[PDB]
DNA sequence: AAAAAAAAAAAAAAAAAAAAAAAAAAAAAAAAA
DNA sequence: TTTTTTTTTTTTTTTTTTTTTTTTTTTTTTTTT
């Protein structure tokens, strides 16, 4: 019976494994140099020593080593825009401290991790923390009671537990009881809990956290600033290593065009991979700057000119008429009746006949599904409101030239 | 497809083009069906009965499984899916269980079979205007159920509106629209004269009158009667069931000088323009208490008579709203007996609200607090009848 | 008679090729190659990717995915080291329903014949525990999410955040496909979901904007193919069915045409499409909508007319189907009203032309109608209730819409234009001259 | 980043030269396109501009009122203009944006 | 007398699409009327001509609650003459129950609406459309409880709704007449001291 | 009496509370031996 | 008479629907000219 399977799953007795391949995977001797550079430029291949994040590594390592050696516990809050190496630096500090604990240079500790976006409710945070100490899946009330008995009652020899909370702002709700429980357990003396919380917004503790929760969160913060173009160039150049599959100016072009938009590292590592896949098709062993410009045109896309260029005749007349009605009445949100009057004017100027209003609603629905315009349901015909989602100069560029 | 059209053309005269198109599209199950057909028309055009008879004849003569719905019944989507999977996957009993659209699509996918049997499915969703009031994924999945379930099925939608009312903010798939245009005068006369044998046998069922009946109640006589009927009735309605239900009664009146013993347009032209005035009433003096009568005409004067003029008329568009203090003030002003404000008077106000002679335009949560606003919902003739049976002239106070 | 059975076979072949045949794709030489090489690099080399097919509704988005999958799946290197999870945003309207479907389609340990045990949170924990425990030694999962913007509308985009997080992590090599009709779907993502999405987007604007490609497509959709091409297509379809659409596909091995019949049919088709009336009808259709679904709808209604008394396709049949397409429908609803509703609509048109589209009422329109009905010598004997029922019939047919009060006093709007009523006055049968004269002034 | 500088400069310009603080995302992007047209900079489309505005909102400089459509989101500045001018530290650029009134 | 007329109407519908309905023009005094309907129900349980559900206006705020109350009333009326959940009561279960019970023998399905004026209008129109759609499947008779006049029924039933209606008007004797009869035969009767 | 602010109220989105359904667990009845 | 199996009822847990809070926008009232 599968109820024994679920009994052993909720107790953690059988491991959740996955199906395996019938073919053995490829060897690194059969791969080309461009395939090896494509494998090293994958964002999932995180390096052991991260470039450009040495000072943040020193900060987090000093905090965590002090909180482990002092046997006290506390809390830290790191933050920054996505792709700036927050979780990679924090888990690298955790791996370095675990390597130092395996060689008796440090007191031992137990490292738990949760992610606020891998939970469906914040209360299920209690189900995951208790699933990382014992391995049993219980209800959240029983898990919260057992965690409360673990962290309030003193018991020698308790070991230090370092709790990582990714995406803290998903645990914040109207009542703020999960985040208050996770930031209140370090304040007790019997709990050797160190809570490091990672998020994106810098002003999160003052924006949406209550006064006691930002009172317990602390003032030891760290901000992961976005990467400059020198830093993206150093990241990608360290990913490539001793190969010469990339040019020295191609990496600089990716770094200059990515560091100006977001400062993300995932964006640079994906645009370089797309450039590698473009250069693989053109039968060249290196990635020149033209493949990089082609990949930067494809990944940083802007395809609202080609969509208007590929519309039909009546749809382009409708797109001219919405812009002409916006010019005529001044306001941006135009009803269907004035748009249809301008349709009749433009079609009588062009000399072609137009469909009746029942098919003009079909043209409006086709343009609204593609989100070239913003339209309502067609149940209120001749009085439905139309916004022009594309700019008015884009239509005059797409149709004139 | 010729057998189904040749079998439906006796039952539906003057619909040979519509039955021809429906036999071209979904007539033969050995050929593939379009993804969705949408046939639409006015009321009384015969689009419930035609698709119902078409689906029954296709299920009898061929290997299809039919389902006829009504989208008014489906207050949730689980009701619609339960009816659909009950009719499309029969002999299932109380084991039928459809959670959502996904379970419906998987259980329809399991109903596929081999190619040599030539099976098909047909779904008729009558009153389809309600489909755009449902949970916003019913209509886009119904329009592509053939592609989704990988079946030889067609979804027939029936409504009184064109398909231009159905386009939503995300778009819809393609559909084969079909128009059932309402009949003109000659086609309507042909439909009304199609039941001549039934009318003749029912008349002969109900003895010199029977002998003088069976000599001339013939087809030309019934067609001249239908000409005299449609000369007066066709301007107000073209709806075929109403014309049938009134033409039978006017024939029952029309045959009186013929059975008793030109020359016939006058004796029916009395009752024909008597019965034209009672079209759309399918029928085969409001007594009130004294103070309820006075409260009702006081509410009429409160809604009608321009509340700035209340300072002059009693102190000695649309119906305007009033508060119950103004109603009681006008009631005590026009009664001139000055009865006691007991509980029965305010109970009469509440039960005149309850009987839909008044209404609640505003308030309804501060009824005792003075912010509730009422409105009178009767006409002038009833107020004049009340003032006549009481003796109080309202036109003096109007 | 033999000449009718061959036409039944031709009509059945053309209808089944138009409706079915989910794998044959026309055009898209670069986009199909991009999607195919991406899926093959995921399955063979174990890479994790994400992709977004974009384009208008009616272009070959699902057909490109079906063509790529039907060409990759009988390889027995893609077919044996890869499991495929199809999700649809119209059916999987919740992350819970989508997660039960992912758990069933991956054949996980808590599935047990299509009835997943555990809650939504337990199913998410078990799915991420299975995907985290994998690596390059495990099978590749290919998630194909159609109606992707509906997956963007879920709670916290939480399933999206997880499906894009296994792609960015040293876990089981999954590949995420997103097939949606919107062009600005990437501004519906949150900043973390947008950061984890590899921004490669494939755009599928149709390559039949110019009219000669439209005429070539209308020729290739109506032609009978060569028997060797028929045998090659039946070979590929039987091969993909040897290992989902393949249960009911086109399968052109059942149809065999003689060379003289195919010769006569293709000569007739090219002779018809060379004319000016057929090209004028295709020009009207190409002016309205350039997608292939509209043309396939036209050609289905054209092929369904092939009765054995009239076997050939001719240009007047195409003109008749174009006349069916191009007409207005509210005008044809207006020609079915009685004369009482027509005088009511003329009174509404007079009120809107005088007062500049002010909202009207039953009493205003009834007064304007009763001023005409006193001198008409045909509408003397209409009551108030019959005109109220005619007003209600105009209201429920949505020729009159409310501004969203008593029923005889609720305000309204005319849902027609003046040109539609002016064409109704010309197309109406047996309209009396009093109404036709009152409509002018 | 440069595109975030050109976003904040355009929002400061539209808050200076107009008394209406109801600034949408499309109305901000239409002025930003003219601004980057005058600087000979290839401006982002709407899809990347929305992510740029969100990445500036993570710093706390803005606040985005979310609506049914991303064109109708309302950007509300929550810093003083001296604070924005100090945080950019790019005086030769913002001095040129505020002198470019004609592209509004 | 009016009870015998209504029973003959139900039986003559059973001896026989639009649904047969019967507007019963009662007085403005509503709490006097429902007991009258109870007497009709007893006579309809005498000849085994039908089984009767009563739909109060308090139970029919929405269409879902009206259909659930209708099916639950009919099923519990059959259970009491000779338990489903609230969300389980559907028209499909009513059709299956009527096929399992009374297709072998037909009982009409009399639906009594005692307070016709106090109904939500859209709920009442959609309920009449639901009942008229199931004609031929389930034999429905619709008894109304109109208190004011027939102008109210003609006003609140639109064109498309009254296109599926074959009503026959009955009349009850007036409340002043009943008062004068009670005063003549009881309060002035000599056999009370 | 109109222009403009201003407080109150309505609409709508979003989060929580409660009801309902479904599964787990414990108690009871009936068969196994 | 004692043990094991299958039914029934209770309690817990999860899902869905309804209510409540919260933000935004409108809107009718109030002050100034
Ligand atoms: N300094 C660096 N050197 C090398 N690789 C880097 C560096 N910073 C980031 N990366 C790469 O970019 C990715 C960033 O992922 P990471 O989880 O660190 O981002 P994050 O800031 O946590 O994002 P989010 O806030 O959205 O969770 C990593 O997978 C890593 O491979
Ligand atoms: N051409 C016709 N020949 C014979 N009878 C017809 C014809 N058209 C309609 N009828 C009759 O009209 C009756 C009612 O029509 P039906 O119920 O189909 O109207 P409908 O199209 O459903 O309108 P609604 O949707 O408003 O109810 C049917 O019983 C049918 O017999
Ligand atoms: N490039 C193409 N090659 C072959 N057939 C096509 C092509 N484009 C469109 N079609 C035809 O258009 C019809 C719909 O195509 P498809 O299902 O690919 O569109 P879609 O993008 O999936 O539509 P939706 O977005 O509504 O699901 C199909 O019948 C298909 O035969
Ligand atoms: Mg992270
Ligand atoms: Mg009907
Ligand atoms: Mg598709």
């Amino acid at each position: 019976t599968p109820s024994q399977k679920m009994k052993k799953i909720r107790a953690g007795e059988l491991s959740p494994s996955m199906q395996q391949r019938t073919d053995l995977p490829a060897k690194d001797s059969s791969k080309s140099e461009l395939q090896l550079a494509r494998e090293q430029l994958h964002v999932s291949v995180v390096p052991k020593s991260l470039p450009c994040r040495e000072r943040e590594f020193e900060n987090i390592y000093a905090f965590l080593e002090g909180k482990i050696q002092d046997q006290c516990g506390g809390c830290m809050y790191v933050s920054g825009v996505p792709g700036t190496g927050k979780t990679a630096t924090v888990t690298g500090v955790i791996r370095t401290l675990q390597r130092m604990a395996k060689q008796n240079e440090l007191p031992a500790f137990e490292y738990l991790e949760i992610n606020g976006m891998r939970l469906t409710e914040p209360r299920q945070a209690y189900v995951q923390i208790y699933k990382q100490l014992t391995g049993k899946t219980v209800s959240w009330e029983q898990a919260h009671a057992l965690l409360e008995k673990r962290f309030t009652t003193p018991a020698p020899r308790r070991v230090t537990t370092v709790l990582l909370v990714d995406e803290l702002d998903i645990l914040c709700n109207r009542r703020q009881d999960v985040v208050y429980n996770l930031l209140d357990w370090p304040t007790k003396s019997a709990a050797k809990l160190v809570v490091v919380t990672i998020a994106n917004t810098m002003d999160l503790p003052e924006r949406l956290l209550m006064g006691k929760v930002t009172s317990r969160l602390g003032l030891t913060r760290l901000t992961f600033q976005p990467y400059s173009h020198k830093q993206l160039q150093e990241i990608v150049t360290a990913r490539l290593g001793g190969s010469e599959t990339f040019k020295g100016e191609a990496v600089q072009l990716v770094a200059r065009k990515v560091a100006a938009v977001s400062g993300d590292a995932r964006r640079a590592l994906d645009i370089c991979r797309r450039a590698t896949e473009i250069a693989d098709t053109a039968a060249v062993k290196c990635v020149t700057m033209l493949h990089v410009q082609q990949a930067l045109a494809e990944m940083i896309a802007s395809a609202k000119v080609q969509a208007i260029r590929n519309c039909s005749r009546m749809e382009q007349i409708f797109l001219q008429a919405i812009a002409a009605e916006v010019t005529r009445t001044g306001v941006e949100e135009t009803t269907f009746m004035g748009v249809y009057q301008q349709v009749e004017t433009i079609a009588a100027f062009m000399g072609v006949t137009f469909p009746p209003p029942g098919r003009a609603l079909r043209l409006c629905s086709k343009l609204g599904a593609e989100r070239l315009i913003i339209s309502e349901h067609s149940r209120n015909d001749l009085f439905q409101k139309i916004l022009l989602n594309v700019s008015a100069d884009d239509i005059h560029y797409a149709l004139r030239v | 497809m010729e057998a189904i059209c040749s079998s439906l053309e006796p039952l539906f005269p003057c619909r040979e083009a519509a039955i021809e198109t429906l036999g071209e599209l979904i007539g033969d199950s050995s050929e593939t069906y379009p993804s969705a057909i949408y046939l639409f028309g006015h009321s009384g055009t015969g689009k419930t009965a035609l698709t119902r008879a078409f689906l029954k004849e296709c299920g009898k003569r061929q290997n299809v499984r039919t389902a006829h719905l009504n989208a008014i019944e489906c207050y949730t989507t689980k009701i619609m899916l339960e009816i659909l999977l009950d009719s499309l996957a029969p002999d299932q009993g109380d084991a039928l269980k459809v959670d959502n659209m996904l379970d419906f699509v998987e259980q329809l996918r399991r109903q596929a079979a081999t190619r040599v049997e030539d099976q098909g499915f047909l779904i008729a969703v009558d009153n389809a205007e309600r489909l755009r009031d449902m949970d916003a994924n019913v209509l886009p999945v119904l329009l592509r159920l053939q592609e989704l379930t990988n079946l030889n099925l067609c979804v027939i939608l029936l409504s009184q509106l064109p398909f231009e009312k159905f386009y939503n903010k995300t778009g819809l798939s393609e559909i084969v629209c079909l128009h059932l245009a309402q009949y003109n005068k000659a086609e309507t006369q042909r439909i009304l004269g199609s039941d001549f044998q039934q009318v003749r046998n029912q008349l002969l069922e109900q003895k010199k009158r029977l002998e003088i009946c069976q000599e001339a109640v013939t087809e030309d006589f019934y067609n001249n009667y239908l000409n005299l009927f449609l000369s007066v009735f066709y301007k107000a309605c073209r709806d075929v069931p109403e014309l049938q239900l009134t033409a039978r009664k006017c024939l029952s009146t029309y045959l009186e000088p013929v059975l008793d013993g030109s020359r016939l347009w006058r004796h029916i032209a009395g009752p024909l323009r008597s019965a034209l005035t009672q079209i759309y009433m399918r029928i085969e003096s409001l007594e009130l208490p004294y103070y309820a009568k006075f409260l009702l005409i006081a509410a009429f004067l409160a809604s009608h008579n321009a509340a700035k003029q209340d300072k002059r008329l009693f102190v000695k568009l649309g119906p305007k709203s009033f508060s119950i203090d103004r109603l009681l003030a006008i009631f005590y002003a026009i009664l001139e007996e000055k009865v006691g404000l007991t509980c029965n008077l305010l109970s009469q106000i509440s039960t005149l609200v309850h009987l839909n002679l008044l209404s609640f335009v505003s308030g309804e949560q501060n009824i005792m607090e003075g912010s509730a606003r009422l409105q009178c919902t009767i006409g002038l003739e009833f107020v004049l009848q009340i003032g006549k049976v009481v003796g109080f002239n309202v036109r003096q106070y109007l | 008679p033999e000449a009718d059975r061959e036409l039944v076979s031709i009509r059945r072949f053309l209808k089944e090729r138009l409706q079915r045949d989910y794998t044959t794709l026309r055009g898209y030489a670069k986009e199909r190659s991009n999607v195919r090489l991406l899926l093959q690099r995921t399955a063979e080399m174990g890479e994790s990717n994400s992709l977004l097919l974009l384009g208008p509704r009616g272009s070959g988005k699902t057909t490109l995915i079906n063509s790529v999958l039907a060409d990759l799946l009988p390889n027995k290197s893609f077919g044996e080291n890869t499991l495929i999870v199809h999700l649809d945003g119209n059916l999987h309207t919740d992350d819970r329903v989508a997660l039960k479907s992912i758990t069933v389609q991956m054949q996980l340990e808590n599935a047990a014949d299509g009835k997943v045990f555990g809650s939504f949170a337990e199913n998410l924990a078990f799915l991420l525990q299975c995907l985290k425990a994998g690596g390059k030694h495990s099978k590749s999962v290919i998630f194909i999410l159609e109606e992707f913007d509906l997956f963007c509308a879920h709670h916290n985009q939480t399933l999206l955040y997880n499906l894009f997080d296994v792609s960015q992590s040293a876990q089981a090599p999954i590949c995420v496909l997103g097939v949606t009709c919107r062009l600005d779907v990437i501004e519906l993502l949150e900043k973390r979901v947008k950061s984890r999405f590899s921004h490669r987007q494939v755009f599928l604007f149709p390559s039949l904007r110019r009219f000669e490609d439209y005429v070539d497509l209308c020729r290739d959709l109506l032609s009978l193919p060569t028997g060797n091409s028929l045998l090659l297509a039946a070979e590929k379809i039987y091969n993909l069915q040897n290992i989902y659409f393949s249960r009911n596909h086109f399968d052109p091995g059942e149809y065999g045409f003689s060379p003289r019949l195919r010769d006569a049919w293709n000569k007739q088709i090219c002779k018809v499409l060379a004319t000016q009336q057929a090209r004028s009808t295709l020009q009207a259709l190409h002016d309205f909508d350039i997608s292939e679904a509209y043309l396939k709808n036209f050609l289905f209604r054209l092929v369904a007319h092939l009765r054995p008394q009239s076997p050939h396709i001719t240009a007047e049949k195409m003109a008749a189907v174009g006349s069916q397409f191009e007409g207005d429908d509210k005008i044809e609803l207006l020609c079915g009203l009685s004369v009482l509703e027509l005088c009511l609509i003329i009174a509404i048109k007079h009120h809107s032309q005088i007062y500049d589209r002010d909202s009207f009422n039953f009493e205003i329109i009834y007064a304007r109608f009763s001023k005409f009905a006193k001198v008409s010598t045909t509408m003397q004997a209409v009551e108030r209730s019959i005109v109220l029922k005619a007003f209600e019939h105009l209201r429920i047919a949505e020729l009159i819409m409310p501004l969203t009060v008593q029923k005889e006093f609720e305000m309204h709007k005319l849902a027609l234009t003046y040109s539609q009523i002016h064409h109704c006055m010309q197309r109406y049968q047996a309209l009396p001259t009093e109404v036709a004269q009152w409509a002018q002034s | 980043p440069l595109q975030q500088k050109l976003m904040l400069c355009t929002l400061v310009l539209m808050l200076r030269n107009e008394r209406n603080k109801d600034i949408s995302m499309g109305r901000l992007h239409e002025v930003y396109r003219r601004v980057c047209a005058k600087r000979n900079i290839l401006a982002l489309d709407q899809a990347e501009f929305t992510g740029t505005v969100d990445l500036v909102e993570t710093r706390g400089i803005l606040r985005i009122m979310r609506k049914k459509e991303p064109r109708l989101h309302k950007v509300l500045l929550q810093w003083d203009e001296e604070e924005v001018h100090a945080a950019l530290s790019d005086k030769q650029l913002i001095a040129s944006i505020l002198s470019d009134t004609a592209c509004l | 007398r009016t009870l015998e007329q209504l029973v003959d109407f139900v039986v003559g519908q059973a001896e026989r699409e639009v649904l047969p309905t019967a507007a019963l023009l009662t007085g403005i005094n509503q709490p006097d009327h429902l007991s009258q309907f109870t007497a009709l129900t007893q006579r309809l349980h005498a000849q085994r001509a039908a089984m009767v559900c009563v739909l109060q206006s308090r139970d029919c705020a929405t269409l879902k609650a009206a259909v659930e109350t209708l099916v639950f009333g009919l099923v519990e009326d059959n259970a009491e003459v000779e338990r489903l959940r609230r969300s389980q009561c559907t028209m499909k279960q009513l059709k299956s129950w009527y096929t399992n019970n009374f297709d072998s023998e037909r009982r009409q399905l009399v639906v009594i609406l005692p307070d016709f004026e106090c109904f939500n209008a859209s709920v009442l129109q959609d309920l009449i459309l639901i009942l008229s759609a199931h004609c031929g499947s389930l034999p429905f008779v619709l008894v109304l409880g109109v208190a004011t006049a027939m102008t109210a029924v003609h006003g609140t039933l639109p064109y498309h709704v009254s296109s599926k209606i074959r009503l026959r008007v009955f009349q009850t004797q007036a409340a002043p007449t009943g008062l004068n009869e009670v005063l003549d035969k009881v309060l002035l009767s000599p056999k009370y001291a």
Side-chain angles (χ1 to χ4, degrees), chain B residues 59-67:
Chain B
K60 175 170 192 175
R61 294 285 181 89
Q62 286 172 16
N63 211 46
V64 313
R65 306 199 211 161
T66 70

PDB file of all heavy atoms in Angstrom, chain B residues 59-67:
ATOM      1  N   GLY B  59     -27.365  11.069 -33.071  1.00  0.00           N
ATOM      2  CA  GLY B  59     -27.125   9.982 -32.142  1.00  0.00           C
ATOM      3  C   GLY B  59     -27.852   8.708 -32.517  1.00  0.00           C
ATOM      4  O   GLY B  59     -27.350   7.609 -32.272  1.00  0.00           O
ATOM      5  N   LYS B  60     -29.038   8.831 -33.114  1.00  0.00           N
ATOM      6  CA  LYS B  60     -29.781   7.652 -33.541  1.00  0.00           C
ATOM      7  C   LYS B  60     -29.161   7.013 -34.780  1.00  0.00           C
ATOM      8  O   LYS B  60     -28.933   5.800 -34.812  1.00  0.00           O
ATOM      9  CB  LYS B  60     -31.239   8.024 -33.808  1.00  0.00           C
ATOM     10  CG  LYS B  60     -32.072   6.894 -34.377  1.00  0.00           C
ATOM     11  CD  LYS B  60     -33.545   7.251 -34.391  1.00  0.00           C
ATOM     12  CE  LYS B  60     -34.405   6.029 -34.687  1.00  0.00           C
ATOM     13  NZ  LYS B  60     -35.863   6.326 -34.585  1.00  0.00           N
ATOM     14  N   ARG B  61     -28.881   7.811 -35.809  1.00  0.00           N
ATOM     15  CA  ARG B  61     -28.439   7.263 -37.084  1.00  0.00           C
ATOM     16  C   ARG B  61     -26.955   6.930 -37.120  1.00  0.00           C
ATOM     17  O   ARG B  61     -26.534   6.147 -37.978  1.00  0.00           O
ATOM     18  CB  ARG B  61     -28.758   8.244 -38.213  1.00  0.00           C
ATOM     19  CG  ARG B  61     -30.238   8.458 -38.452  1.00  0.00           C
ATOM     20  CD  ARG B  61     -30.858   7.270 -39.162  1.00  0.00           C
ATOM     21  NE  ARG B  61     -32.281   7.473 -39.416  1.00  0.00           N
ATOM     22  CZ  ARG B  61     -32.768   8.052 -40.507  1.00  0.00           C
ATOM     23  NH1 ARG B  61     -31.944   8.487 -41.449  1.00  0.00           N
ATOM     24  NH2 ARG B  61     -34.076   8.198 -40.660  1.00  0.00           N
ATOM     25  N   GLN B  62     -26.151   7.501 -36.224  1.00  0.00           N
ATOM     26  CA  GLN B  62     -24.702   7.365 -36.317  1.00  0.00           C
ATOM     27  C   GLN B  62     -24.080   7.039 -34.966  1.00  0.00           C
ATOM     28  O   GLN B  62     -24.786   6.695 -34.014  1.00  0.00           O
ATOM     29  CB  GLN B  62     -24.080   8.643 -36.879  1.00  0.00           C
ATOM     30  CG  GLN B  62     -24.289   8.838 -38.367  1.00  0.00           C
ATOM     31  CD  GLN B  62     -23.823  10.189 -38.842  1.00  0.00           C
ATOM     32  OE1 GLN B  62     -23.078  10.878 -38.151  1.00  0.00           O
ATOM     33  NE2 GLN B  62     -24.264  10.581 -40.028  1.00  0.00           N
ATOM     34  N   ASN B  63     -22.755   7.139 -34.880  1.00  0.00           N
ATOM     35  CA  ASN B  63     -22.004   6.729 -33.702  1.00  0.00           C
ATOM     36  C   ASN B  63     -21.563   7.906 -32.840  1.00  0.00           C
ATOM     37  O   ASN B  63     -20.494   7.846 -32.228  1.00  0.00           O
ATOM     38  CB  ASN B  63     -20.786   5.908 -34.121  1.00  0.00           C
ATOM     39  CG  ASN B  63     -20.401   4.871 -33.088  1.00  0.00           C
ATOM     40  OD1 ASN B  63     -21.254   4.155 -32.565  1.00  0.00           O
ATOM     41  ND2 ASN B  63     -19.114   4.797 -32.776  1.00  0.00           N
ATOM     42  N   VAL B  64     -22.350   8.976 -32.778  1.00  0.00           N
ATOM     43  CA  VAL B  64     -21.934  10.134 -32.000  1.00  0.00           C
ATOM     44  C   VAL B  64     -22.511  10.059 -30.590  1.00  0.00           C
ATOM     45  O   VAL B  64     -23.468   9.333 -30.312  1.00  0.00           O
ATOM     46  CB  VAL B  64     -22.324  11.447 -32.699  1.00  0.00           C
ATOM     47  CG1 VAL B  64     -21.929  11.397 -34.156  1.00  0.00           C
ATOM     48  CG2 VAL B  64     -23.791  11.716 -32.559  1.00  0.00           C
ATOM     49  N   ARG B  65     -21.889  10.805 -29.680  1.00  0.00           N
ATOM     50  CA  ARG B  65     -22.370  10.977 -28.316  1.00  0.00           C
ATOM     51  C   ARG B  65     -22.653  12.453 -28.106  1.00  0.00           C
ATOM     52  O   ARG B  65     -21.738  13.277 -28.187  1.00  0.00           O
ATOM     53  CB  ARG B  65     -21.350  10.488 -27.290  1.00  0.00           C
ATOM     54  CG  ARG B  65     -20.865   9.072 -27.489  1.00  0.00           C
ATOM     55  CD  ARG B  65     -20.245   8.556 -26.211  1.00  0.00           C
ATOM     56  NE  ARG B  65     -19.176   7.598 -26.453  1.00  0.00           N
ATOM     57  CZ  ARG B  65     -18.247   7.282 -25.558  1.00  0.00           C
ATOM     58  NH1 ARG B  65     -18.256   7.851 -24.364  1.00  0.00           N
ATOM     59  NH2 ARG B  65     -17.305   6.401 -25.859  1.00  0.00           N
ATOM     60  N   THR B  66     -23.906  12.787 -27.829  1.00  0.00           N
ATOM     61  CA  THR B  66     -24.346  14.170 -27.780  1.00  0.00           C
ATOM     62  C   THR B  66     -24.533  14.642 -26.345  1.00  0.00           C
ATOM     63  O   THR B  66     -24.671  13.847 -25.414  1.00  0.00           O
ATOM     64  CB  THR B  66     -25.653  14.351 -28.549  1.00  0.00           C
ATOM     65  OG1 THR B  66     -26.714  13.702 -27.842  1.00  0.00           O
ATOM     66  CG2 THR B  66     -25.532  13.740 -29.924  1.00  0.00           C
ATOM     67  N   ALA B  67     -24.538  15.961 -26.185  1.00  0.00           N
ATOM     68  CA  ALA B  67     -24.789  16.599 -24.898  1.00  0.00           C
ATOM     69  C   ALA B  67     -25.444  17.941 -25.164  1.00  0.00           C
ATOM     70  O   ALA B  67     -24.883  18.761 -25.893  1.00  0.00           O
ATOM     71  CB  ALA B  67     -23.496  16.782 -24.112  1.00  0.00           C
TER      72      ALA B  67
END
